[PDB]
Symmetry: C3
């Protein structure tokens, strides 16, 4: 398999295409600034610390 | 001028047979275990993931 | 409708010198302290990583 990172502005525009995304791809949604990984039969949210202006 | 990416393998043993050739800074996905790692110098950092969402 | 990716730097100082050219939604790896961030608008969200191990743990 192959992989990469796909991006969407809104949770809506994304969930309209999450079906299209192959397993092992990462998914970013700007609305909530969240990151997911596509797995078999679902998706798993990556745990992120809160936004900061500095790389902490 | 450094770009990496995400690489995926179906099983952990398939990944281990090829990971010597993965540079530091790449992400590694192992599908069978649904595990995601950052490849670092001679090692791995596991990414913390939440439970599967349908 | 966009695509991103993963960019890497050896040091945090070199990364910050370039981060204005990194769009929101890209991932940033820094070899200094082996950190991984999601680039967000004018900032960062640090990925939660477990401590490095020699074997995928």
């Amino acid at each position: 398999c192959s992989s990469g990172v796909r991006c969407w502005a809104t949770r809506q525009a994304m969930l309209g295409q999450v079906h299209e995304v192959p397993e092992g791809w990462l998914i970013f949604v700007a609305e909530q600034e969240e990151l997911y990984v596509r797995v078999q039969n679902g998706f798993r949210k990556v745990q992120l610390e809160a936004r900061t202006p500095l790389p902490r």
